[PDB]
Amino acid sequence: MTLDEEYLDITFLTENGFVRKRCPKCGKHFWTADPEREICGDPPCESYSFIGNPVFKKPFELDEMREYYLNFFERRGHGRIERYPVVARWRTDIYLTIASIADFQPFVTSGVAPPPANPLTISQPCIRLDDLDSVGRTGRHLTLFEMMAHHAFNYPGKEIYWKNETVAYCTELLNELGVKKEDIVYKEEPWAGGGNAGPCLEAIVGGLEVATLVFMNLEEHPEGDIEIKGARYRKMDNYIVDTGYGLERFVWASKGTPTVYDAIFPEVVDTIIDNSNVSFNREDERVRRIVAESSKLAGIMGELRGERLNQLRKSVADTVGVSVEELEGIVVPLEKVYSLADHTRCILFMLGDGLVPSNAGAGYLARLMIRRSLRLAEELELGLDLYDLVEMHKKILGFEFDVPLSTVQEILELEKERYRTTVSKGTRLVERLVERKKKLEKDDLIELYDSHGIPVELAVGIAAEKGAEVEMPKDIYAELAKRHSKAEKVQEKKITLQNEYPATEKLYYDDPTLLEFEAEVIGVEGDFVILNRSAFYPESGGQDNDVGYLIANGGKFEVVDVLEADGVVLHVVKGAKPEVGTKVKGVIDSDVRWRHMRHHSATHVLLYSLQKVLGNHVWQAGARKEFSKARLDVTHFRRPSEEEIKEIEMLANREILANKPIKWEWMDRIEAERKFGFRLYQGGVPPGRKIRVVQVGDDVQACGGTHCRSTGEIGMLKILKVESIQDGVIRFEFAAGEAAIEAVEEMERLLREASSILRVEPAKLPKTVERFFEEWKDQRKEIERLKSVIADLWADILMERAEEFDSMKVVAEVVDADMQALQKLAERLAEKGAVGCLMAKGEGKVFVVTFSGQKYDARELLREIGRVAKGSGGGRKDVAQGAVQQLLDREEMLDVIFRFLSEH
Amino acid sequence: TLDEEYLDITFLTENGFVRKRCPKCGKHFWTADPEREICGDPPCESYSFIGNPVFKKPFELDEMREYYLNFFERRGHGRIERYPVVARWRTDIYLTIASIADFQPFVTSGVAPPPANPLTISQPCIRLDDLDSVGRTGRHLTLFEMMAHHAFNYPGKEIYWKNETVAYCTELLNELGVKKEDIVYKEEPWAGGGNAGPCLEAIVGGLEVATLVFMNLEEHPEGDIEIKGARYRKMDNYIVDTGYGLERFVWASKGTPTVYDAIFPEVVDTIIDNSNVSFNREDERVRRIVAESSKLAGIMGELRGERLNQLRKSVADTVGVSVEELEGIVVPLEKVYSLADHTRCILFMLGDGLVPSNAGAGYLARLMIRRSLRLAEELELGLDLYDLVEMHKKILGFEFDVPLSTVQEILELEKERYRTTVSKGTRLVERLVERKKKLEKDDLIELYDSHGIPVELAVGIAAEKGAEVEMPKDIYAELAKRHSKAEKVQEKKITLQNEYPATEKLYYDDPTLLEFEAEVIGVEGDFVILNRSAFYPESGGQDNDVGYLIANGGKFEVVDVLEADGVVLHVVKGAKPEVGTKVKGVIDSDVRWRHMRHHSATHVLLYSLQKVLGNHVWQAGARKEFSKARLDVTHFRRPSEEEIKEIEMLANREILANKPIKWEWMDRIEAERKFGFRLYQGGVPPGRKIRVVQVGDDVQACGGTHCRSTGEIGMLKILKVESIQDGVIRFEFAAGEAAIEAVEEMERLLREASSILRVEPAKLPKTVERFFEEWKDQRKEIERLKSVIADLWADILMERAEEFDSMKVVAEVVDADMQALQKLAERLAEKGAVGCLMAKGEGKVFVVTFSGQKYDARELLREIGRVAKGSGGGRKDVAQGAVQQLLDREEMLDVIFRFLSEHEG
RNA sequence: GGACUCGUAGCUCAGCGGGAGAGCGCCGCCUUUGCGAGGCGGAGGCCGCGGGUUCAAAUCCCGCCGAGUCCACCA
Numbered sequence A: 001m002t003l004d005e006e007y008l009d010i011t012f013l014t015e016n017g018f019v020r021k022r023c024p025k026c027g028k029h030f031w032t033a034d035p036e037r038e039i040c041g042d043p044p045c046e047s048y049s050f051i052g053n054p055v056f057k058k059p060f061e062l063d064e065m066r067e068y069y070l071n072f073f074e075r076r077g078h079g080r081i082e083r084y085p086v087v088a089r090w091r092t093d094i095y096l097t098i099a100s101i102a103d104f105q106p107f108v109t110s111g112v113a114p115p116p117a118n119p120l121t122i123s124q125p126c127i128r129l130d131d132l133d134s135v136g137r138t139g140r141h142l143t144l145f146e147m148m149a150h151h152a153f154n155y156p157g158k159e160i161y162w163k164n165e166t167v168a169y170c171t172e173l174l175n176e177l178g179v180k181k182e183d184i185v186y187k188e189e190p191w192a193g194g195g196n197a198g199p200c201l202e203a204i205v206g207g208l209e210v211a212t213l214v215f216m217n218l219e220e221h222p223e224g225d226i227e228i229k230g231a232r233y234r235k236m237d238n239y240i241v242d243t244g245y246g247l248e249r250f251v252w253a254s255k256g257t258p259t260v261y262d263a264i265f266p267e268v269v270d271t272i273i274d275n276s277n278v279s280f281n282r283e284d285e286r287v288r289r290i291v292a293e294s295s296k297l298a299g300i301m302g303e304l305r306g307e308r309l310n311q312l313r314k315s316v317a318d319t320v321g322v323s324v325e326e327l328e329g330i331v332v333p334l335e336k337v338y339s340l341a342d343h344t345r346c347i348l349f350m351l352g353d354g355l356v357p358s359n360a361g362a363g364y365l366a367r368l369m370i371r372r373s374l375r376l377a378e379e380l381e382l383g384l385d386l387y388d389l390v391e392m393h394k395k396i397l398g399f400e401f402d403v404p405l406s407t408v409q410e411i412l413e414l415e416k417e418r419y420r421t422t423v424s425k426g427t428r429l430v431e432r433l434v435e436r437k438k439k440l441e442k443d444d445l446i447e448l449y450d451s452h453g454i455p456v457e458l459a460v461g462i463a464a465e466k467g468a469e470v471e472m473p474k475d476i477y478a479e480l481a482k483r484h485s486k487a488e489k490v491q492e493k494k495i496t497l498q499n500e501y502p503a504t505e506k507l508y509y510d511d512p513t514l515l516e517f518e519a520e521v522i523g524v525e526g527d528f529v530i531l532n533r534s535a536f537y538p539e540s541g542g543q544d545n546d547v548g549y550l551i552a553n554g555g556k557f558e559v560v561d562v563l564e565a566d567g568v569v570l571h572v573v574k575g576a577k578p579e580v581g582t583k584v585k586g587v588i589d590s591d592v593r594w595r596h597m598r599h600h601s602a603t604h605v606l607l608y609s610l611q612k613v614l615g616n617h618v619w620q621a622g623a624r625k626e627f628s629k630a631r632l633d634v635t636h637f638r639r640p641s642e643e644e645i646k647e648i649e650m651l652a653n654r655e656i657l658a659n660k661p662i663k664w665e666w667m668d669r670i671e672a673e674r675k676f677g678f679r680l681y682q683g684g685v686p687p688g689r690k691i692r693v694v695q696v697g698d699d700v701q702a703c704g705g706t707h708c709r710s711t712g713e714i715g716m717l718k719i720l721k722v723e724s725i726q727d728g729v730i731r732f733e734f735a736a737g738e739a740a741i742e743a744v745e746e747m748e749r750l751l752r753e754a755s756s757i758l759r760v761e762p763a764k765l766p767k768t769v770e771r772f773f774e775e776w777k778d779q780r781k782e783i784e785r786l787k788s789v790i791a792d793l794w795a796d797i798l799m800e801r802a803e804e805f806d807s808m809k810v811v812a813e814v815v816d817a818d819m820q821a822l823q824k825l826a827e828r829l830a831e832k833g834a835v836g837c838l839m840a841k842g843e844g845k846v847f848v849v850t851f852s853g854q855k856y857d858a859r860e861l862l863r864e865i866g867r868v869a870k871g872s873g874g875g876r877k878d879v880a881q882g883a884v885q886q887l888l889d890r891e892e893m894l895d896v897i898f899r900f901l902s903e904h
Numbered sequence B: 001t002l003d004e005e006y007l008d009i010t011f012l013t014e015n016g017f018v019r020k021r022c023p024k025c026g027k028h029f030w031t032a033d034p035e036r037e038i039c040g041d042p043p044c045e046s047y048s049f050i051g052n053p054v055f056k057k058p059f060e061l062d063e064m065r066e067y068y069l070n071f072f073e074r075r076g077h078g079r080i081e082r083y084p085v086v087a088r089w090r091t092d093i094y095l096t097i098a099s100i101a102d103f104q105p106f107v108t109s110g111v112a113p114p115p116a117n118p119l120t121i122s123q124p125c126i127r128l129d130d131l132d133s134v135g136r137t138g139r140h141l142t143l144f145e146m147m148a149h150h151a152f153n154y155p156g157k158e159i160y161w162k163n164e165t166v167a168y169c170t171e172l173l174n175e176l177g178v179k180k181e182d183i184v185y186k187e188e189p190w191a192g193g194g195n196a197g198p199c200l201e202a203i204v205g206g207l208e209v210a211t212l213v214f215m216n217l218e219e220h221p222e223g224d225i226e227i228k229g230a231r232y233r234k235m236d237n238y239i240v241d242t243g244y245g246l247e248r249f250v251w252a253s254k255g256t257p258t259v260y261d262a263i264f265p266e267v268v269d270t271i272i273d274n275s276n277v278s279f280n281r282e283d284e285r286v287r288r289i290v291a292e293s294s295k296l297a298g299i300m301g302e303l304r305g306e307r308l309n310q311l312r313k314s315v316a317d318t319v320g321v322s323v324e325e326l327e328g329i330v331v332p333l334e335k336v337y338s339l340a341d342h343t344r345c346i347l348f349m350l351g352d353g354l355v356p357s358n359a360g361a362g363y364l365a366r367l368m369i370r371r372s373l374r375l376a377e378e379l380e381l382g383l384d385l386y387d388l389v390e391m392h393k394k395i396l397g398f399e400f401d402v403p404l405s406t407v408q409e410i411l412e413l414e415k416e417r418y419r420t421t422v423s424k425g426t427r428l429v430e431r432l433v434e435r436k437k438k439l440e441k442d443d444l445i446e447l448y449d450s451h452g453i454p455v456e457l458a459v460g461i462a463a464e465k466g467a468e469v470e471m472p473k474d475i476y477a478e479l480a481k482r483h484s485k486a487e488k489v490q491e492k493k494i495t496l497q498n499e500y501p502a503t504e505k506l507y508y509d510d511p512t513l514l515e516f517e518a519e520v521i522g523v524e525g526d527f528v529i530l531n532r533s534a535f536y537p538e539s540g541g542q543d544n545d546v547g548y549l550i551a552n553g554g555k556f557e558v559v560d561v562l563e564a565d566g567v568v569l570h571v572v573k574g575a576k577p578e579v580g581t582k583v584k585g586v587i588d589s590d591v592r593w594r595h596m597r598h599h600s601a602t603h604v605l606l607y608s609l610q611k612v613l614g615n616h617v618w619q620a621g622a623r624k625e626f627s628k629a630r631l632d633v634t635h636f637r638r639p640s641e642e643e644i645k646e647i648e649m650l651a652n653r654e655i656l657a658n659k660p661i662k663w664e665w666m667d668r669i670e671a672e673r674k675f676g677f678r679l680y681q682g683g684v685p686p687g688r689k690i691r692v693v694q695v696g697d698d699v700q701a702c703g704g705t706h707c708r709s710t711g712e713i714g715m716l717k718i719l720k721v722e723s724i725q726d727g728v729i730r731f732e733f734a735a736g737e738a739a740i741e742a743v744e745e746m747e748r749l750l751r752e753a754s755s756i757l758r759v760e761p762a763k764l765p766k767t768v769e770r771f772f773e774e775w776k777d778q779r780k781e782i783e784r785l786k787s788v789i790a791d792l793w794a795d796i797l798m799e800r801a802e803e804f805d806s807m808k809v810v811a812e813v814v815d816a817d818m819q820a821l822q823k824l825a826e827r828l829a830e831k832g833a834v835g836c837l838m839a840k841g842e843g844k845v846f847v848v849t850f851s852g853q854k855y856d857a858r859e860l861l862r863e864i865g866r867v868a869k870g871s872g873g874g875r876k877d878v879a880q881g882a883v884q885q886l887l888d889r890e891e892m893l894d895v896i897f898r899f900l901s902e903h904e905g
Numbered sequence C: 001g002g003a004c005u006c007g008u009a010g011c012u013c014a015g016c017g018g019g020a021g022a023g024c025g026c027c028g029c030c031u032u033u034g035c036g037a038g039g040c041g042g043a044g045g046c047c048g049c050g051g052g053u054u055c056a057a058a059u060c061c062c063g064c065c066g067a068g069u070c071c072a073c074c075a
């Protein structure tokens, strides 16, 4: 917490004219070089002053400021570094880059690995979605921003510089930028994040935290000597300089514009206004006067949300002279504009550095920013697509990205399809639930977006439409991002049985061809046999495991599976059990190990191919080879066409044909990252100061395991099945070598045994199959017509076989048929104005049917017929249906008809 | 003319020989005496040595060779071990007919030096040309070993000529037992294999034991001299040809009745003991009857006619046996001798890799199996052909490249393949006896020709069914030879318009680099020629090395690439740079590589097929079309699916082993001695130096582009396996990106078919069978329903039919297709209805007339066919046809009435 | 290498331009005293695949596929 030394160990502040004092309400001590005046810099006590009168000696641009800051610290002794990707590929804890120091943790910060240079300087772009809700409302917060920084890594006894010389330099740069030493305030505070924390002081000028100098010394650990934000941090041996400068906030104070958005990307802001439904004009002088007051005091109203927000809103509106209900004709719509302008910029870096939208993982955070951005464009009714804004952001910044704008658009265009589609099914669920619930808690909105893909802002309108009362908390959206910001530990069942053995050697790194080894054993517990010097290949992924037997003088021992725990090897044995301390020699099954090598080599080739064919946005989620199968999972927005499938398999095997060398050797992480890039961690992140580098062609990956010497040892890659497991990811199924031939052979056998039962040539199978099929449809459609015609004719043959009575053809026959026939017949007889009835000797009781196209009632007829043959039924005027217990002869059929037909 | 060369022999004159003219055959010869022979006497001589061995001691097959072989080996000759009986090294002949044929024609034309000089070898030879004699003459064989010794002489220096040749011969004769005066030397012209020359037939004991040729002639289209139809020219290269009948040498030493009884007595004994033969070999009669029959055998061969019965009576009465009885021993023996000899020939054919076929080289082997089987039937042999062949492998004691287990499986196939054919054939003949009720030659020639049924069988069956027969014995080969046609006569290649000397291509030692740097030499039409190149001319559909040919001015391109000997051809469709400015050229990389992959993979598959199946498989053909390829090998039956599978397995095992593929120019003599005759599966390349290619293990003479290693060829996939002809099998395949695209193409056809029936690609067949079964049912149910429609329709019209003499007639225009009309009428006819029906169609109206009574319907069709101008016909009950003018019921009934009026009284 | 013949019910095949049939085999009922046959009845067909001719194709022509045979420096 508080240690007197760090506060007074500074030989610069105190000895260059700096004093500090604490105010009652804030309670925090701030170093001011102006003893005459006292300010603070936090929301409850400060307002921005520099608007109109730029504190700096000159307005600067965002790209001219990078160099001015970077070139400055370049000639002080610091080395220059290039920006890291906004996605955390190098670490396992988080998805996105939180800080500039987040680039170096936990490997350089825990001293395990060296730094690229010491000291270093950088303009690292970060995405902080914790401050998401505060974006647009305060005018000083951004989702994506370049955090200028300059670090210095110091180990027990050595350092380039410490807090004194730099704050000095920090103060100097400002003095070289047109800022007098007294206008600067250093508010003392702690700063945490990424597992590393430490005491700091935040540089405040014009009432704006433009910089932040963190002096971190504590590493996160369950011991938790200190307690910070509920997290447990603990002191480490080495200490490190961690500084953070906001490029975004520096240009703002140079140009002296209302908000940070008008300072950085004015083109976008001005463009959004002109092509959205916002009423007011931004050029008009009347509006400009409003904006000046609206922006100069925006710092506090951002942290305020409720009726207390109106307590400041009411006060701020009157000074201008215009009502509170009219001020919100600008401040409320501008928020929607400022946010969309900023969020779009964040879309650039997210998608530009290889993020693919999904329902989970790092793709969720990508999707989230697009989803919300799409919503804001419907509240502004923008005539532009979201891509059109990105187009400006790219050219305004002048950055070069791994993922091209061609890829960016196809994603943004596919998402609006999915967004608008996932909305239609949602509203009915919303409008139904708001009537049962009648209220909306914090959890209801979070449940809405994650489960049903419905934005928060959309839910509030439908809530207001139907009377429900809704409670939107502060950081409502930041809660969404944070809850999906943790890269899950992918924790699987771990067994660490105490063997009291902390040592273990591995032998298959140098040469995978070496299939047999020689060493002593100490294995004692379980079914597992632990050997000090073993060349077996264990894995917790179920498979990719070597297999073999062991013979000594006592007998033979067979090992089916091989596992690993705490860096120590395990060998399962079913059969006899070896004696501890035996000089043994192990043998690997040649085929199984050879197969992994052939297959594993193929996997690294395929990943290269997918990247080369589709785009640079391809990264890998998982990999597993089943018995006679194998799979690879990559990031992609849509299911690949069969045109692309062919291109993939072509390229992968074109690499085989080249037979390129497959080198493996250990490299230093910093030396490795510098040489290739963060593509090196596609299959995971290996620890240690030195890692194992694998190269299969132009593909370079940290893949400790078995491989071939050349790409031609693989054989051929044939994709078996391609499907989409989830939005954003697609699963491939492939096989090479022996499994390639078998797969291909099986496809022949199907093609051969299918074309041979149609007596056609396999090359003509597609065209001949449709021919057989189209005929099968037509001849089926034909059959039901012939059956109709049989009834069409059987009717015509019964009108002739009918005697006439009162100018009406009455027919009465006994025919052999089923019930439907009698109905399908009588309906056609009554369509030709005929009257009478029919009977069928069906199994059981005699089925009867009557009919009449004339005015005579059919059911009435059946009643009379019924009491002669003992039975009854029902029906309508045109046809009738029934069943009796005895058949009736034709002559006795006629007289009943003639009797019935006469009376009416 | 020819006398000048026979008379030059100083040896004959110097060593007491003399040239006489025998007054019987009108030909000259030599003899070492005037008066000891007191012969020859009219017309020719018989055997004398039967009962009287000419040699000092009886020899054997093995004993004879080593004596003969050592004889020349110690006298300076070079011993080269025998060639296979199959013509592998030659494209002209099918099997080795003479010992000299092992060196024709490249060695015999001076292009290549002989293995050594001089030479000597007991070489196996097959002559199915002279079979008809074999079995009767008692001196002929289908297969025999021809011991020889050859000298090869160039202009200026020789090893030895005709004088020394005869001298070396007489010595071997005299050192063996026969006196110099018993030996006779007859002058006969000789030709064969493309090389001809004057010759001396050596006759001792009344038998031709040796023959030697002095090749001064070789075949040419413009030859001045003429022998056996073909033309020969004078050689500037003279070769000494000799040939000693090993089997005949052994025979004379044993003094046995027949050569058959000397070479393989055991084989002959096995047959006779288990046959239906009417006698016992041990009796005095048969020993005596045969001993004299064998003496007069040599005449009954070269002279066949009606006087054979007179000579038969001569030997019969001289041995005093009834003429029918002599046949009772002679005729069954001939079959036994032939079969015993045939089986011996069989052995070497399969053993050296001849796979029985219905055509080509393989048919030679089949034919021999056929004849062997026919004889076994007449003898009612209790053993299979394999048993007899098995003996020869032991008796002759030779080692073959082809295993004997393979041989039996080939015999069991060919035996069953015959018994299947004769059954199919016999049943056909019977069916003629009930249809033709007679047999004639036009049939009989066709029965044998296109069904393999021997002339005798048909007559035998016809007599078992008592059918008229005639057997044209001498009209057998005429119609088989009568009708012909050939399109072109000239040489294979288009002769070039202009010539330029000494071309060369460096791409042999450099397939790895495409581009070159050379200069222009000459230009002609669309094609051009340069100094040196890396372009490899295509043979067949593909194998083309395609490339863009730039200049100092502009860029040009080559479409196809061909070759003229001594000049590379580059086919272009466009402009042409003149000789003035020399140019450079480029080659397409992707196109080149695909062929190099196919080339190497072609060798690889052949290597696989041998290992998987057997040594009996040889490449009989190979070529490729882009995205495809083919390779033909000799195998008796289309492989089982497992065999094809493992072949594909083994092939892909070899692509991963990554065996280096070396390649180097070698001379002929050293090339074939080190490897084996597998070298000439690719072809027979003319020239002194030969480009050989070592692909992993297998080595061939390939002048085509190749790969550095078997890893560059990529995956190999057999596309299709069809049996071209029984005994020859073709394999279709592809490797590299061509294999990728072919499997991808194969995958599409399956995927596509499934997306038509909306099913899993795995269930496609079992779902198709379902649809097919239903399709057959629904097609069948429509037939039943349609019959009811007609059955119902027929009754409808009978009710409203006009009555004409108690005959109800119907004439209406109905709405139904052609098949309904026809089905309708045949129902109306069955119920005695008369008239016609019509229906609107497609630029036509179908008309059907019908009659259940005496009136003829096909006549009615024309009577209504005059009215509306429509043709057609059919049976008497119904008639089908079309018309261009529809007729109203009245118009029709006006005709029906008119027709009916014609045919009553 | 050059030709010839044949693809039709499970099998052997006839029909060879206008109704797809016979023999044997298969399912059933009838007669028998002559155990196995006889009598009567029925199911079982892309008439090899694909184009051309004709009003009409199992049928005539062309091509492919498959099953066969002879001849042969003639081919």
Ligand SMILES: C[C@H](N)C(=O)NS(=O)(=O)OC[C@H]1O[C@@H](n2cnc3c(N)ncnc32)[C@H](O)[C@@H]1O
Pocket: A098, A099, A100, A101, A128, A131, A140, A141, A142, A143, A145, A147, A191, A209, A210, A211, A212, A213, A214, A242, A243, A244, A245, A246, A248, A249
């Ligand atoms: C240096 C330390 N690792 C750190 O990250 N400090 S910080 O969290 O305060 O951020 C560093 C600098 O970036 C800027 N910054 C921080 N959060 C920001 C946000 N949500 N939007 C825009 N800029 C921000 C501030 O100017 C700040 O001084």
Ligand SMILES: C[C@H](N)C(=O)NS(=O)(=O)OC[C@H]1O[C@@H](n2cnc3c(N)ncnc32)[C@H](O)[C@@H]1O
Pocket: B097, B098, B099, B100, B127, B130, B139, B140, B141, B142, B143, B144, B146, B148, B208, B209, B210, B211, B212, B213, B241, B242, B243, B244, B245, B246, B247, B248
């Ligand atoms: C070698 C010479 N070019 C040549 O062909 N000579 S020849 O045709 O006359 O036959 C060579 C020798 O082999 C033997 N021979 C030839 N034809 C034979 C046959 N059909 N059966 C057995 N022996 C034969 C004869 O003894 C003959 O002298």
Ligand SMILES: [Zn+2]
Pocket: A600, A603, A604, A683, A703
């Ligand atoms: Zn891997």
Ligand SMILES: [Zn+2]
Pocket: B599, B602, B603, B682, B700, B701, B702, B704
């Ligand atoms: Zn070759």
